[model samples]
Target chain A: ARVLAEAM
Target chain B: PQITLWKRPLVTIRIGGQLKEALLNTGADDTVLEEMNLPGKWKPKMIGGIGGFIKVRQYDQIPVEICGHKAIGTVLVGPTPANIIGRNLLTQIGCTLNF
Candidate 1:
């Protein structure tokens, strides 16, 4: 599963 | 803010409940999974955030477990830094700010 987010 | 009935805010959840660790992120608007293989039809989407935008595959009605709570919703899979449990899944798991 691949998922991108805002930031850490 | 939503507080887990368990010990800490960060908890284990799964896309199909595979025991993956994820942070319960209130600031995020959607749930993001990192480098996961989802079995289903997905549509290409471009999601943006603090670091700009990234391409992702969005699967609808994906089964997930948020700390053992079962839910089905949209899940985005791509180059996320961390697996995140966002409001989309959070609300399904009864996560909300009572204030």
Candidate 2:
């Protein structure tokens, strides 16, 4: 998995 | 660029004289990067995301180049899972989502 971190 | 909601919208961006790959996240309100050293003064801030909140350094008027497009905006510096180019910078680069 790559960078899939989403922010708010 | 009109990006479709398919894969992670990633792009190459240059900020603080550092070239890095970041995600063009429309879901984010602020741009966040890893723990990179930056010049000038910054304000301590706390931001929230899908999981929880985290503290970061809020730097204003930072110049960023998103795929060769220039923009000046606020950038949050801290320990992020991955570099992200939020709406703050995405809009400046004339990026929009299309179905």
Candidate 3:
């Protein structure tokens, strides 16, 4: 579950 | 600049949205987690790669977390030490965006 500072 | 790089630019953006920067930070951590510090801050998965390919100048400007170090900046026009996803890929290709 890597949260992106960008997208999905 | 035709480039292909980091999906998330850096700390300056969030939820895929742009945030503060009217102010700055130390060592590139404006809310700038060490990437590893960020992984520690929020729960997430990390990946490892050799290097990310860029198209010279076509990468989107967004938030990017690498080697556990996140920052807000546009993808570069070519491969950079920052885009070195191998030892650099801390996490990516997962988190669902709000927008």
Candidate 4:
């Protein structure tokens, strides 16, 4: 999974 | 809601528009260009992230742009959305997969 930025 | 603002360029962003136009409030514009709300204050919806970002394209909108079959293979698709559970499991076990 891509490191989602914050609670994005 | 002041119920005084007009529609169209008759009003202004009080802010400029920006390519990330999606960042601006468009989905449910303040109102049809005819509603009456003048002092009601609102800023364009700002999205500082993508996970929560609205899915721009539908699941099957693109007809075969990219292709893949998660269950059709045995190797796996690499770190995917579902892999988080594995990470959680490792965390619970106090170990790292370094996947």
Candidate 5:
């Protein structure tokens, strides 16, 4: 998966 | 906004999900999993969150089973406190909000 710029 | 959004829908990953659980966060852009052994080569990447940014492993197009539905997409492995299923795989399973 791509790195999420924001946290969940 | 914090308290309100905290009540959003959520679920877990893997068989029975007890192994790991995460939020079904539509707000999130990609799926993030806690540190685990992944079978393929992963590229290093930086991921940001509410607190700060973290280094992670980006695995491309890994097959995932969500509630018995099969999906293939990116899976980010890192020090994330929780697992997160994002829109990428969610849409493949035909997930949507009804309100």
Candidate 6:
């Protein structure tokens, strides 16, 4: 898993 | 039931009957997990994060227990660097910003 700066 | 603000808001959670760690992220709109074998059907999709957009598989209605608070929502599996608990699950767990 990774940190999401943005997602949809 | 408090987690102090830190460099990263990492916490332990139970998903698919297994214990794993995840970041309680508010910035993200959906939860994303690392590459793993999950039973049931899923759909292909694309997601973007720190390293930019990448292809992934979307699995819906997966249950996750964050600190014993369980919730079901969409979860994307990809080559993510870490697991993220997005608003979908966070809201059900009653998580909020407290400063």
Question: DockQ for all models, in order?
Answer: 0.17, 0.10, 0.05, 0.14, 0.25, 0.64
Q: Rank the candidates by lDDT, best first.
A: 6, 2, 1, 5, 3, 4
State in Å the error of residue B93, model 4.
2.7
TM-score of the B chain in each candidate versus the native B chain? 0.85, 0.92, 0.21, 0.14, 0.80, 0.91
TM-score of predicted model 3? 0.21
Look at candidate 1 and tell me the lDDT of residue B70: 89
Model 1 chain B: weakest 10-residue lDDT segment is B1-10
Docking tier of model 5: it is acceptable
Q: Which candidate has the highest DockQ of all?
A: 6
Candidate 2 lDDT, B1-99, residue by residue in tens:
566556777788889788999888767788988888888899998888767788999899999998889999988889898888878788787887665
Candidate 1, B1-99: lDDT as tens digits = 347535535778766636788877777777878878878899898877776788988899998987778888988888887777778888897876754
Worst 10 residues of 3 chain B by lDDT: B21-30
Model 4: native contacts recovered, as a fraction: 0.23
Compared with the true structure, the alpha-carbon lDDT of candidate 5 equals: 0.73
Model 5: residues with Cα > 4 Å off, grouped in runs: A1-8, B1-8, B15-19
Rate residue B24 of model 2 by lDDT. Answer: 80
Q: Please provide TM-scores, in order, for all candidate models, with all chains considered together.
A: 0.80, 0.87, 0.21, 0.16, 0.76, 0.89
Error of 2 at B52 (Å): 0.7
* Candidate 5, residue B22: lDDT: 65
What's the C-alpha lDDT at position B37 in model 6? 81
How is the predicted docking of candidate 6 categorized under the CAPRI scheme? medium
Candidate 1 CAPRI classification by DockQ: incorrect
lDDT of 6 by residue, B3-77 (tens): 786568888888877888998989988888889888789999998866678888999988888888889988989
Show pairs that collide, candidate 4: A1-B79, A8-B51, A8-B52, B3-B36, B3-B37, B4-B37, B4-B38, B5-B37, B5-B38
- Tens digits of per-residue lDDT for model 5, B14-34: 632344566776767788888
